[PDB]
């Protein structure tokens with residue numbers, strides 16, 4: 123895939139995010155970091171282990187969000203260009219699936235980010251993300267979540 | 276302004292580069308105790324950060340406070356490689372780093388303890404520039 127000054131696009135080679143990421147898709151690896159494929163994989167491992175603490179509703183949504191956010195699909199082009207999470211995807215997880223662990227813990231983060239549910243996790247700030255309805259191709263949408271009760275919109 | 280020797284402390288054993296010598300700043304009357312005390316004080320805040328950040332943050336703090344010395348009989352303290360600094364501050368500790376750094380810096384200032392702050396990562400050299408010119412944190416290898 124495309125390579126450039128700040129990173130490159132390549133197929134995912136790990137096992138944690140295997141079921142979430144599109145099989146043949148290219149994802150962005152950030153060469154600001156050393157051996158980014160290894161570093162990103164070590165991070166997602168540790169992130170997923172922390173998600174054993176969250177509710178059964180929240181878990182698959184947060185897992186998918188962390189995967190789509192830490193391994194961002196590359197949009198077509200000659201440059202390596204990561205697609206951010208759609209705002210609606212972010213807000214869904216924040217306000218619906220993980221409401222108790224994320225939205226509710228806002229303003230209670232003074233007790234410690236690690237002691238505040240989910241706020242220590244490398245999740246994006248949903249306000250700073252583009253919309254599904256501004257350009258549905260410019261961001262990653264909420265994928266199929268495997269649950270094996272539900273928030274309503 | 277100091278000497279290079281084997282790390283003789285308790286905190287940073289697994290965290291420093293294997294079989295390397297590290298830098299002791301002789302601006303302190305007891306550099307090995309003073310630098311040991313700095314990482315001890317840092318651990319008060321390390322306690323409080325998540326296991327996503329904690330091992331990365333410790334690696335950075337230990338290797339910063341106990342700089343790896345270059346090879347040779349007149350060795351020099353190496354900087355941390357830019358990439359490793361960025362991975363720690365902005366990947367592994369993306370949410371928690373600045374708050375932990377604020378708290379650690381201020382606890383040191385309150386105590387009247389002399390210290391160097393972790394550098395701005397962008398001011399550091401790349402690992403690709405010259406692999407022998409900067410420290411690669413063992414946590415990330």
Ligand SMILES: *[C@@H]1O[C@H](CO)[C@@H](O[C@@H]2O[C@H](CO)[C@@H](O)[C@H](O)[C@H]2NC(C)=O)[C@H](O)[C@H]1NC(C)=O
Pocket residue numbers: 152153154155204361365366397
């Ligand atoms: C690749 O990594 C770099 C370094 O961490 C990122 O640049 C930082 O972006 C954050 C936003 O999360 C800013 O707050 C920092 O000021 C930036 N740091 C530097 C040194 O520029 C960059 O965003 C990453 N690229 C992608 C596409 O995620």
Ligand SMILES: *[C@@H]1O[C@H](CO)[C@@H](O[C@@H]2O[C@H](CO)[C@@H](O)[C@H](O)[C@H]2NC(C)=O)[C@H](O)[C@H]1NC(C)=O
Pocket residue numbers: 276300301302303352389390391
């Ligand atoms: C050895 O330690 C001393 C004291 O902590 C360092 O001196 C400080 O250096 C910074 C440079 O940014 C200055 O802002 C301070 O004024 C200095 N403090 C004092 C009281 O002298 C010195 O840089 C260290 N040397 C090395 C090579 O690490």
